[PDB]
Amino acid sequence: ASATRLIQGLRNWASGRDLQAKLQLRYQEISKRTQPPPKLPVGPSHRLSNNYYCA
Amino acid sequence: SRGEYVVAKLDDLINWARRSSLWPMTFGLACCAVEMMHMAAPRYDMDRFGVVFRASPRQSDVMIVAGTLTNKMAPALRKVYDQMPEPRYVVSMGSCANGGGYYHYSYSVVRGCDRIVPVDIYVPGCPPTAEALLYGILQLQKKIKREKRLRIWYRR
Amino acid sequence: VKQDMPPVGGYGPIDYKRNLPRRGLSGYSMFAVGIGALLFGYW
Amino acid sequence: TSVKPIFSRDMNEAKRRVRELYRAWYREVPNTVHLFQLDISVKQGRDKVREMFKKNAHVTDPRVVDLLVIKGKMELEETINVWKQRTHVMRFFHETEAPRPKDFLSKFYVGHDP
Amino acid sequence: MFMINVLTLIIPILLAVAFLTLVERKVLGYMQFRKGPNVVGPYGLLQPIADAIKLFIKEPLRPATSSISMFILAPILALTLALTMWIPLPMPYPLINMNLGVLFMLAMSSLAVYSILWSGWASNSKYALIGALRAVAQTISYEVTLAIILLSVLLMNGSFTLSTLIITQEQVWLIFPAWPLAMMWFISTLAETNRAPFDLTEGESELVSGFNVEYAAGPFALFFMAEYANIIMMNIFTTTLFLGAFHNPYMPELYTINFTIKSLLLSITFLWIRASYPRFRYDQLMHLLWKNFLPLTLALCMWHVSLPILLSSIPPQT
Amino acid sequence: TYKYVNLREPSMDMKSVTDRAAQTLLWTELIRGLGMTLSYLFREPATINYPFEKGPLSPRFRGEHALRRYPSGEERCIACKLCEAVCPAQAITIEAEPRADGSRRTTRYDIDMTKCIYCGFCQEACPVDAIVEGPNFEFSTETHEELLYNKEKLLNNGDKWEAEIAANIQADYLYR
Amino acid sequence: PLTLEGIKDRVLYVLKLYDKIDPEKLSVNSHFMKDLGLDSLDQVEIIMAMEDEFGFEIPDIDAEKLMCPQEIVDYIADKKDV
Amino acid sequence: MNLMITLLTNFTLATLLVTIAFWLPQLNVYSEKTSPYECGFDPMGSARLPFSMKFFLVAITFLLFDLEIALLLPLPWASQTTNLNTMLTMALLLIFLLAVSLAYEWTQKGLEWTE
Amino acid sequence: VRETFPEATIIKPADIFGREDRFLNYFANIRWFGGVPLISLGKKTVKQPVYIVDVTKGIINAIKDPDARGKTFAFVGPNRYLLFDLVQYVFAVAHRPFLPYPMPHFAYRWIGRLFEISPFEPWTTRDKVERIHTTDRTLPHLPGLEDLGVQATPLELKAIEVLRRHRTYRWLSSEIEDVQPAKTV
Ligand SMILES: CCCCCCCCCCCCCCCCCC(=O)OC[C@H](COP(=O)([O-])OCC[N+](C)(C)C)OC(=O)CCCCCCCCCCCCCCCCC
Ligand SMILES: CCCCCCCCCCCCCCCCCC(=O)OC[C@H](COP(=O)(O)OCCN)OC(=O)CCCCCCCCCCCCCCCCC
Ligand code: SF4
Ligand code: SF4
C-alpha cells in the first residue's frame, strides 16, 4: 500500500487489473485481535417445561 | 595459541557455510508435507535462510522426515539417508516421525524415524506449524554453529 | 445475545466470474508495427 | 462336508502345485542371490527355501495348501520382479534376533514364557 | 602480461556466476511474491559465498557403478567449455580476436553437449541416462536452427567476425531488420542452455535431477557454475548479435557499461521467463524447432540471402 | 445449474483469424504471462521476518501442554482421568493416590509429546481446567525423550505460561 | 543322445555330483525314497539336476514316476532315439 | 600460442577445482552410499540395458541437415563474388532442396515419433 | 590393567575384520600405489583373522558369564593363513589385478616417514608395517571363542560382505562361488 504511484501504475499496467482495490496483503480493515465478550444463544431444549427427553 | 585461533576461525567458517547453506531434500510423507510446503510458502519463506530444495539426495544436506514412516517405506527412508553425503542431518517433523504419533500402536508404522535414521532435531506437533518447523530449522542451524570439528581435530 | 452474525443489509457483492479484460493491440496493428520495424532496419 | 475348492480337487493336484512351486523357487534362488547381491551362498538360500517348504508339510486340507501355493507364487512374483529388496529377502534369515531358549532350564532362567 | 588478462577474464565471470545465483534466487523470489536470500549477508550479498564453500567441503561421493574416468572428466570439460566461450566475445575488444569467432562459439556450443552427455552416461543410473538422451533430443532440435539463424544474421555483417558486429550496428540495432531471427534466436538460446521452459535435462519433476542426479557436491558445483556461465555468455553473445552498443575507440568503458546493462537485462529476462512458464514435453520441443522454427528459419534465410542482392546492401568482408 | 468449461468455438472471420495468427506468430499470451509475473515483481512480498515477527494466532491455539493451578497455589488436577480416557493417541498416563492431607491428587501424569496429536480433547474434557494446551509451539528438542513430559515438566510449563494461558482462557471461555 | 551307455553314466555323474545320496549305495536300480532315504523335494531337485545336465524340460506327471535312475535313463531313452 | 595458453589455463583451473573438491573434505565411504539412485529403492536391472530411441529418424536427419550448414555457411563470403545471379540461384536452390527434404519428411510422418 | 583390577577380563583378538576394518580394507585400498609391497613376498608370517561379530558375541557372553572374571581370552579365527595367500584371497574377492613384489628393510621402514608427512590420518605407518608382518601367536592355554560358546566364522563367509565395496562395476554383480578359497596352514 506504500508502493509509489509510478511503481503502482507500472504494476497495474503489467497485471492489467486494478490491484489496489484488491490487495492480498491485509491492513487495518480486518477484524480487531481483541474482541468483546460474546453471549451465545441456547438451543431449543433449554426449557423448564414441556421438555421431556422421551418426546 | 596461534593454531588454536586458526582452527577456531576455520570451524566458524565451515559452520557458517554449512548452517547458512542448508539444502533440504524434497521429502514429504504425509500431512506434515503440507506444512513443510507452507514453510516454503511466501509467508515463512525457507529460501531467505539459504534453505532451498534439492531433489536428489546427493545434492542435499538435511532430510526432513515429514510425515508417517510406515514399515513399507522404512528401507526407502534408510537408503535415501544413506545416499546423502556427509555431513547429513535429519529433522524429524510431526508426531508420527517423532515417536509413532497418532498411529503409534499400528501394525505397519515404524514408531519414530529414530529407529531407522539418526535424528538431530525433533519438531513436535500434529502438524507443527510452519513457524514451528522454521523454528526447528533455525535450531538446527544453531546446532551446526556450535560444532567443534577442527577444534577437536587440532586437540586430538 | 452476541454472536458472529452478518450485518443488517447483508455483505457487499463478491465477484466470482472470469475477468480477463482483453488487453493489447489487434492483429493488423501488430503486423504493421513489425513490418515497419523490418523496413526501417532494412533501409 | 461338501465345500468348494480353489484349484485342486484333491491332494494329488495340490502336491503337483506344491512341486511346481518348489521347482520355480529352486530356479529362482541363484538369480535372487545374484541380482540382490546378497551375502549368502546359493546353497544357503536353497536351504532356506527347503525349510520354508518343510514348515508346512503337515496339512491334509486341499484348500489350505492351495492358498499356500497362491501365497508362495505371490512371494515369487514379488521376488522375480524387484519389488522386495535386500531387507525383505533377508527377513527370512532371523539373524539379528538372538536364539531363543529352547530347553526348560534356560527358559526358567531368563523369563516366564513356557 | 597476457596471463593476467586471462585471469581477469575468467575470475570475474566466476564471481558473476556466484552473484548470479543470488540474483536468480532473489528475482525468482520477488516474482513469486516471496523474498529471496536476505539473511546471510546484507540483503543476501554473502549467500553465494556460503553456497560455494559448502559444496567444496561436502563429501564428493564417487559412485560404485560409475565409469570413474569419464565421471570425473565430464565436469572438467563442462567448466573448461564454460570458460573458453568467452574468449572471442568483444567487450569491445575480445581476449582472443578471431577471424571466425562465431563458428568458434558454435563449435564450442556443440562440444559442450558432451559434458552433460558423458556425465549422464558415466554416472551409471537410470534417470541420468534419461536426462543424457533428452540432452540429445534437445540438441538435435536446437543445433539444426542455431546455425541457420546465426548464418542469416551474419549476411548483414559480412563475415564470421564478432568484432565487426559492432561496426555493423553503428547506425541501427540489428534487432530492427531481423526481429523474427532475434525472437527465434532467443528461444534457441533458451533451448541451448537447458533453461526453462526448456529445462528437460535437469527436469526436477519428470526426472529427479536428470543428468547430474549422481553428482554430489564438489563435482556438482562445476555443472551449476557451468550452466550459469553459459547463460551469462549467451546473453552477452545475444547482446553482441542484436543489441550492439556505441563504441568510442578512445573510451571503451562506454561500450562496456552499455552492453553490460543490456546483457543484465537479457539475463533478468531469462530469470523472468523461468519464473512464469510450464515446461515442455520434449517431443513438443522437437515438434517446435523442426516443425515451426526450421521452415520459417529457412524462409528467412532465403530472405536474408536474396535481400542484400535486392537492395545492393551486401556488406563488406573487410 | 451447470456450465460447460471449454465449449467456445473460435470465430472464423478474417479479423479473428488474423488475431489468432498474430497471437501465434507474436506470442500475445506469453507476454501476458510475463506481464503478470513482472506485476508480482514490483509488490511488497508477504514474508514476515521470523524470528523477529510472529505469525498471527488466536486464543484458541493448541500448542504445548500445561497444568494450571488455582489462584491459591493448589494445582487443579484432581486425578479423574477423563483426559486420558478421551485421548485419541493414549499419550496421557495417570496414576494417583491420596496424598498426605487426604486430597485426590496425582502421582504420575505423563503426556508423551511424540504420541500427542494436539487436538485439545484433554483441555475440553478436563472438568476443572487443569490440563490446557497452551500457546507455546517453539518447544523443539534435540533428543527424543525430552518430548516425554512427566508431571514436573507439565507443572513447570503451567508455572511458565500461566500469565498467558489465563488470559487466553479469559478471552475464550465464553465460547465453551 | 548318442549312446544309452553315455546317458546312464551321465545320470550316475549327476547323482554323484548330488550331495545327499550315499555314493556307496548309489546304483542304477536303487530306489530314491525307501532305499536312499530321500525326501520328495530331494527327488524333485534330482529331476531338476537332470534338466540342467541333459537340456530338455521334463514335465511333472512323468517325473513323479521316476523313482530309480533306471526309470530316469529309460525316460531319457523314450524322449530321444538311442 | 595465446589460444593454447588460454585453453590450458581454463582446463587447469577446471581440474584445480576438482582436485580441491576430492582432496579437501572428509570421506566416509561405505557400500550403500555409492549405490545407484533409483528413488529410495533398488534399480530393477542395470541402466546399461537398451534405452530405445523413438526419435531416431529425426536423429538420422540431423546428420543430413547438419551437412547443409556446412554447405550453406559461406553465404556471407559467396555474396562477395562477381557472378551473382548464379550464386543467388544456387543458394536459393540449396535452401529450397533443404525445404523439399523437410517437406517430404513432414508428409511421410517421419518427424512424428514412433509408438 | 591386571595389576590394578584383579578380576579384569582381558581379551586378545588377533586381526579383526569387518565393513569398517583396517585389515581387509588396508589390503584392498593398496592397488593404485604400485603392487602391494611385502617382506619376502609376505610368506614368512602366519595369520588367523577373527570376525567382529564373533568378537562382540564373545565380549557380551563374557559380560554374562560370572566364570570369565579374572580370565584372559584369545579370540582367534577357525583357520590360519599365510599373509601372501591372504592378500591373494583379498584381491581375488575384490576381483582386482595382483602383481606383488618384495620390499625389504632398506626403505619400507622409510615409507613410514614418507607417509605421515601430513597431520591427517596416515594411510600407512611403520608400526602398521611391523604389525602386518608379525605372525599371530598360538596360545592353547588361553581360552578363545569356542570356550565362550561363540562359533568362529571363517573369512570365506564374510569376505564378500567386506570386499564388495571395492569392485569397480565390471565385476560387482558376481557370486561368492567365484573365488577358490585361500589355503590354510
Ligand atoms: C533477443 C531479445 C528478445 C527477443 C524477443 C523475444 C521476447 C519474448 C519472449 C517470450 C517468452 C517465450 C518463451 C518460450 C516460448 C516457446 C513457445 C513458443 O512461443 O513457440 C513458438 C510458437 C509456436 O506456435 P504453436 O506452439 O502454437 O504451434 C502451432 C502448431 N500447430 C498449428 C500444429 C498446433 O510460435 C512460432 O513458431 C512463431 C515464431 C516466430 C514468428 C515470427 C513471424 C515474423 C513475421 C513473418 C511475416 C508474417 C506476414 C506474412 C508476410 C508479409 C509480407 C509483407
Ligand atoms: C568485484 C566485487 C566482489 C565483491 C565480493 C563480496 C561482496 C559482498 C561484500 C561484503 C558486504 C558486507 C558483508 C558484511 C558481513 C557481516 C560482517 C560482520 O559484522 O560480521 C560479524 C562477525 C562476528 O563479529 P563479532 O566480533 O563476533 O561480533 C560480536 C559482537 N558483539 O565477524 C566476522 O564474521 C569476521 C569478519 C568478517 C568480515 C567479512 C566481510 C565480507 C568479506 C567478503 C570478501 C570480499 C571482500 C572485498 C573484495 C573486493 C574488493 C577487493
Ligand atoms: S504427525 Fe500427524 S498431522 Fe503430522 S503428518 Fe503425522 S499424521 Fe499428519
Ligand atoms: S491434545 Fe489430544 S492427543 Fe494431545 S494429550 Fe490432549 S487429548 Fe491427547
Ligand code: SF4
Ligand atoms: S488433567 Fe483434568 S481431566 Fe485429567 S485427570 Fe486431571 S483433573 Fe481430570
